[PDB]
Design an enzyme around this catalytic site. Structure first.
Site: not given
Ligand SMILES: CC(=O)Cc1cc[n+]([C@@H]2O[C@H](COP(=O)([O-])OP(=O)(O)OC[C@H]3O[C@@H](n4cnc5c(N)ncnc54)[C@H](O)[C@@H]3O)[C@@H](O)[C@H]2O)cc1C(N)=O
Ligand SMILES: CC(=O)Cc1cc[n+]([C@@H]2O[C@H](COP(=O)([O-])OP(=O)(O)OC[C@H]3O[C@@H](n4cnc5c(N)ncnc54)[C@H](O)[C@@H]3O)[C@@H](O)[C@H]2O)cc1C(N)=O
Ligand SMILES: CC(=O)Cc1cc[n+]([C@@H]2O[C@H](COP(=O)([O-])OP(=O)(O)OC[C@H]3O[C@@H](n4cnc5c(N)ncnc54)[C@H](O)[C@@H]3O)[C@@H](O)[C@H]2O)cc1C(N)=O
Ligand SMILES: CC(=O)Cc1cc[n+]([C@@H]2O[C@H](COP(=O)([O-])OP(=O)(O)OC[C@H]3O[C@@H](n4cnc5c(N)ncnc54)[C@H](O)[C@@H]3O)[C@@H](O)[C@H]2O)cc1C(N)=O
Ligand SMILES: C[As](C)(=O)[O-]
Ligand SMILES: C[As](C)(=O)[O-]
Ligand SMILES: C[As](C)(=O)[O-]
Ligand SMILES: C[As](C)(=O)[O-]
Ligand SMILES: C[As](C)(=O)[O-]
Ligand SMILES: [Cl-]
Ligand SMILES: [Mg+2]
Ligand SMILES: [Mg+2]
Ligand SMILES: [Mg+2]
Ligand SMILES: [Mg+2]
Lengths: 282, 283, 281, 283
Positions: D175, D188
Site C-alpha cells: 500500500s 495497518y
Molecule cells: C487502504 C489503503 O491503504 C489503500 C489501498 C492500498 C492497499 N489496499 C490493499 O488491497 C488489498 C485489499 O483489497 P481491496 O481494497 O480490493 O479490498 P477488498 O475488501 O475488495 O479485498 C480484500 C479481501 O480480503 C479478504 N479477507 C479479509 N479477511 C480475510 C480473512 N480473515 N480470511 C480470508 N480472506 C480475508 C476478503 O475476502 C476481501 O475480499 C489489500 O491487500 C489492501 O491492503 C487497498 C487500498 C484501497 N482499496 O484503497
C-alpha cells in the site's frame, strides 16, 4: 573477507562480556555538551550493543536513563556503572517485553523512578536466521513479531500518557528494511513494520509536539550477531559494505543524540542510515 | 495554506538577509560547542547567509576555521565573519561567481593558501527561478540554473580532491524537491536530483580513500533565497504546508551539518539527512 | 564472464557490430492494440532499449517517429521491424544537444504523423572515468546537454501538442538510485531525470498528461561496448541478483505499460527493471 | 478536501461490493487479452472483490485458471467466478479464514488438487481498522490486523514454495501507506511496511530458484474495504487528496498485476509498482 574472530553463542539475547573483541560501545574522545540535560529516557534493549552505546552517550549528555532488557544482568549492570559514572540516574528494568502487561509496567516504573518521561527509544530485537521461508515456523514468526514490533506498539502506547510537547520517540529499524535480507525474512518484515510505524506515528503526534524518527543501522558488532549467526558468518561480518568493516556501537550513538535533542527540532518522520556506505535511495 | 510570515519580496537574487522581516534566526543562543570540528579547515559555498551562515557559525562554535564563498553580498558575508570570529577561529571571505569554472578552482586554491589545508567541503550555493510551467523555462534559465546549482558542485569538488585525504569530508546541500518534486521549480528540482545522485556516486568513489560524502535535504527554510525568488503572496504562506506547519529556521539546519562534518558520523556515507518539518519522503 | 569481450571506439555504438546481437524482440510478444493509432516520438529509438521500445510500440499499433544522432544503419533496421507491423515509421536524424533541433523533431513529428500522443525521452551518452578529477568541463556539459537538457527541450516543445490522455516516459537509470563510482556525471544526469519526472508529473496532472519513467539496470546494448572497456564489457550484468544482464526486449513491456491506458492511474513513478537490485522502490 | 463519492458506510468488514454506489468498475471493456498468462494457474487471496476481483478477471482474459481464496462473501465470490469462467478458464472458490495457519496451507493444497499445479501466487487479503490514535489500538486489534495482513502472506507463500519452480511468480499487495504513513492506520501501515520488506527479502531468497517476487502499492482505490472501514464523510471525500483528485477504480490496478505476473517482467524482481493517482513516494 575475515573481519572478526570466528565465534558463536548458545542463547539469544547474546552476552556482550563473552564477545571477542568486546564491541567498542564508547568513544573516549566523545565530549558531552548537556544536549539532553535533565531529560528522562526509557530505552528498550539498552543493556548491550547499540542500546548500551546509546545509554552511555545519553548519560554523557546529562540524561537520566531507564534501561529495559530481558535477563542479561551482567551486561545491564556494566552499562549501569558506565551511565552512573556520568553522574546521572540509572534504573534497570528486567523482563520479557513480548508480554503486553510488562510493556506497560516498564513505562509506569520509569515514571515512578525518574519522575517523568521525555524520550523513548524502542530498540529491543531478536533475530533467528533461516535458510529459507520453508524453515520459518509459525512459532518463530510470531515470537519475532511479538518482540520486534508489537513491543514497540505497546511500550509507545503506554508512554503516550506521559509525553508532552517537546518529547521524542526514536525507533531502531535496520538496513534490512530497505535492502532486504534473504536469511532474515521474518526479521526484515518486522523492521519494515517499524519503518512504516515510525512514519505513521510521526504524522499522528506532530500537532502534539512529539517528534518520531528512526535509525537504520547496517552491520554493527553487538551481542545480537554471534548469538544469531554461525561462526563462519560472524568471522566475515561487515566485509560486504563499502567501508569494508562492521560498525562499532559507539558509531551509532551520535545519531540517537541528534534525534533525541533539540538539534533535530525540525526533524520528524525520518530515518538516519548508519551503515558503512550502503546506498538505500535515502 | 495560511500566513506564516509577512508579505515581502526582493527584486534581486541572491537575496540580502539584512533586508528580511523577520530576520532569519541563524543562531541558537542555547547552542553549546564541544570541539567537534577543532582545528578543521572548512570551505563553504554560499556560507554568507541563510543555511550557509548558520552552518559557518555552528562550525566556528565547534572550533573549525571557515572559508566562506559567496557571490557579492559583502554586507551579509561581513556579518557572518563577525559571528565566526567571535568564536576565536579564522574566517576567510572569498567573493566571486561560482558559475565560472576557473573561479571554482580559485576558491579552493585560496582556501588552502589562507587556512593551510582543507578538511571539509560544504557545497551549498544555489539559485532558483520559479515558473508556472515548463513552457516558461528558457534555455538560458535552464543553463544558468544548472551551472550554479550542480556544475559548481562538480568544479569545486574536483579541485578539492587533490587536497582531501583520509578522514576528510564532503557535504552537499540538496533539497526536499529532489525527493518530492515541485511543479513550479522544475529546472531547480532537476538540479537537486543531480546533487542527490552526485552524492551517492561520489561516496562510492571516495570511500576507499577514507573521504565521506553525505547530504542534507532541507524543506522550507526562512532564508534570503525565499523573498528573492518567490512572489509576496507565496512568501507570506511559506512553510505552511509541512506537517509542523511552519518553515524551519536556518539554525535548525546547522546541527545536521555538524553531525555529518564530524567524527560523530564516521560510519555514515552516501546518505541524506532530511530536515523538513515532517514531510515523509520514503527516507 | 557474461558476454564476449569487446569494445567500440565510437559512441553512440552500432548494434550491428555487437557480439552477440542484443535480443531486441521477443518472438512470443503478442500485441493487443494497446496503442492503436497513437503517434509516438522516441529519442534514441534506433538501437538498444529504444529499438526494443519502438518495435513493441509498433506491435501495439502505434506510429513511431524515431529520433537518433547518426546511426543510419541501425535506424534503418529498426524502421524495417517497425514497418513489418503495418504502422508508420519516421526517421529523424540529428544532434539533440542543440535546442533548435529538439524543437524541430517535435514539429516534424507532428507534420508527418499529424499529432503527438506519447513522448519517450530516451537518448543518452556515458563516458566512464576513474574519478571526478578526470571529468573535463567539456564532458560534464556534453553529458548534461544530451542526457537531461534534451529531455527539457523536447518535452517543452511537445507541450503545445499534448492533450488530455497523452503521456511522457523518461528513461532514467538504476545509477540514479544506487550511484555509480565510474559514472559520476552520467549518474547526476539520471538523478536530474528522476526529479524532472517527479516535478513535471505534478505540473501536468491537471492537464491529464501522465509522466513516468523507467530505470533500467545493466542492459546489453550499444551504449555498453561503446563506453566501457573490454573486460568490463565481458563481466557486464554479473553484479545483479539474476546474474545476467537484461536483454533490450525485457525493457519494452514496461514502456508499453506506462504508455497505454493500462497505467491510467499512474503518474510520477519509476518502473525498476534491473535484474533484482533492491533500490528501496 | 472535497466530495468524490456518495456518503456511505457498511456495518461489517470485509465489505460487500454489490452494496456500493457507484459499483466499482472492475473491468475495462477495451482491455484485450493476449495470452500473457498462457497455461498458468493462479491462487489469489482476497480475489473475490475490489482489486482482487479486477485482477482475477484480467488474469482470466490472459489465459490463466484462477483459484480465489476469500473469507465469506459468497455473493461477491460467485459473481467473480461468473466473470472469470466467461473468459474461457476454470475458476475455483476457496472460502475460509486465512488468519488460521492450517487454512493457509489447505488453500494451496486445494488449488493444486483442483487445478493441477500452481504458477502464480497473489497475496492480497487485508483488513483495516482506523483509529484516531495509538491509544485506541487494542492488543486484540493489533494482533488480528497482523495475523491476516502479513502472517497469512507468510503461511500461504511458505506452503506454495513446494509447488513453485523456475518461471513461477509471487505478487504481494502492499500500500502507499507503507511509504507515506497514515496517522489513522498506524497498525495497518505497519503490516504494509512488513509486506514491502517481505517482498524485498523473499525476492533475494528465491532468485536462484527462478521465482520472481514483486509488489503493487495502491493508493486510494474504490473497493469494499473503504465503505466498511471508514465513516460516511471520509468515504465521501475518498481520493480527493491525490494529485489526480479522484480515487482509482479496481480495473486500473489489474494491468500492473498482469505486468508482474507475466514473462513481460522477466527482468523484474524485488520491486513495487505504485498505482496511486500521482503521489510521489521517492520511487
Ligand atoms: C487502504 C489503503 O491503504 C489503500 C489501498 C492500498 C492497499 N489496499 C490493499 O488491497 C488489498 C485489499 O483489497 P481491496 O481494497 O480490493 O479490498 P477488498 O475488501 O475488495 O479485498 C480484500 C479481501 O480480503 C479478504 N479477507 C479479509 N479477511 C480475510 C480473512 N480473515 N480470511 C480470508 N480472506 C480475508 C476478503 O475476502 C476481501 O475480499 C489489500 O491487500 C489492501 O491492503 C487497498 C487500498 C484501497 N482499496 O484503497
Ligand atoms: C541485525 C541487523 O540486521 C543489522 C543491524 C540493524 C539493526 N539492529 C538493531 O539494533 C537493536 C538492538 O541492538 P543490538 O544489535 O545492539 O543487540 P543487543 O542484543 O545488544 O540489544 C538487543 C536487546 O534486545 C533486548 N531483548 C531481546 N529480547 C527481549 C525480550 N523478550 N524482552 C525484553 N528485552 C529483550 C535484549 O535485552 C537485548 O540486549 C535492534 O532493534 C536490532 O534490530 C542491529 C544491527 C546489528 N547489530 O548488526
Ligand atoms: C529551495 C528549496 O527547495 C527549499 C530549501 C532546500 C534547499 N535549499 C538549499 O540551501 C542552499 C542555499 O541556501 P539558502 O536557502 O540558505 O539561501 P542563501 O541565498 O542564503 O544561500 C545561497 C547562496 O548561494 C550563493 N550563490 C548564488 N549564486 C552564486 C554565484 N553565481 N556565485 C557564487 N555564489 C553564489 C550566494 O552567495 C548565496 O548566499 C542551496 O543549496 C539551496 O538549494 C534551501 C531551501 C530553503 N531556503 O527553503
Ligand atoms: C547505462 C546504465 O547505467 C544502465 C542502463 C540504464 C539506463 N540506460 C538508458 O537507456 C537509454 C537508451 O540507451 P541504450 O542502452 O538503449 O543504448 P543506445 O545507444 O542503443 O541508445 C541511446 C541512443 O542515444 C542517442 N543519442 C546519443 N547522442 C545523441 C545526440 N547527440 N543526438 C541525438 N541522439 C543521440 C543515440 O541515437 C543512441 O541510439 C538511455 O537513456 C540510457 O541512459 C541504459 C542502460 C544500459 N544500456 O545498460
Ligand atoms: C513444517 As512447519 C512447523 O514450519 O509448518
Ligand atoms: C519551536 As522552534 C524554537 O524549533 O522554532
Ligand atoms: C594538513 As591537515 C591536518 O588539514 O590534513
Ligand atoms: C519560446 As522559448 C525562448 O522559451 O524557446
Ligand atoms: C487500554 As488497553 C486494555 O487497549 O491496552
Ligand atoms: Cl517470469
Ligand atoms: Mg543485551
Ligand atoms: Mg547570500
Ligand atoms: Mg544507436
Ligand atoms: Mg470481498
Amino acid at each position: 573477507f575475515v573481519t572478526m574472530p570466528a565465534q558463536h553463542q548458545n542463547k539469544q539475547p547474546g552476552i556482550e562480556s563473552l564477545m571477542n573483541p568486546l564491541p567498542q560501545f564508547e568513544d573516549p574522545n566523545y565530549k558531552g555538551s548537556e544536549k539532553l540535560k535533565g531529560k528522562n529516557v526509557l530505552i528498550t534493549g539498552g543493556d548491550s550493543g547499540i542500546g548500551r552505546a546509546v545509554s552511555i552517550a545519553f548519560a554523557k549528555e546529562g540524561a537520566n536513563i531507564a534501561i529495559a532488557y530481558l535477563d542479561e544482568e551482567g551486561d545491564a549492570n556494566e552499562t549501569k556503572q558506565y551511565v552512573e559514572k556520568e553522574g546521572v540516574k540509572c534504573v534497570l528494568l528486567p523482563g520479557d517485553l513480548s508480554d503486553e502487561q510488562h510493556c506497560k509496567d516498564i513505562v509506569q516504573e520509569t515514571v515512578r523512578q525518574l519522575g517523568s518521561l521525555n524520550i523513548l527509544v524502542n530498540n529491543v530485537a531478536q533475530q533467528y536466521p533461516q535458510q529459507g521461508l520453508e524453515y520459518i515456523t509459525a512459532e518463530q514468526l510470531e515470537k519475532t513479531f511479538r518482540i520486534n514490533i508489537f513491543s514497540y506498539f505497546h511500550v509507545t502506547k503506554a508512554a503516550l500518557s506521559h509525553l508532552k510537547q517537546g518529547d521524542v520517540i526514536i525507533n531502531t529499524a535496520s538496513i534490512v528494511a530497505y535492502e532486504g535480507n534473504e536469511t532474515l525474512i521474518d526479521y526484515s518484515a518486522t523492521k519494515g513494520a517499524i519503518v512504516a510505524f515510525t512514519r505513521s506515528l510521526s504524522q499522528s503526534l506532530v500537532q502534539k509536539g512529539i517528534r518520531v524518527n528512526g535509525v537504520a543501522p547496517g552491520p554493527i558488532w553487538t551481542p545480537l550477531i554471534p548469538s544469531s549467526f554461525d561462526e563462519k558468518k560472524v568471522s566475515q561480518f561487515g566485509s560486504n559494505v563499502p567501508m569494508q568493516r562492521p560498525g562499532q556501537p559507539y558509531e551509532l550513538a551520535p545519531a540517537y543524540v541528534y534525534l533525541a535533542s533539540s538539534d533535530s527540532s525540525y526533524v520528524t518522520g525520518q530515518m538516519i542510515h548508519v551503515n558503512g556506505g550502503v546506498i538505500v535511495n535515502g
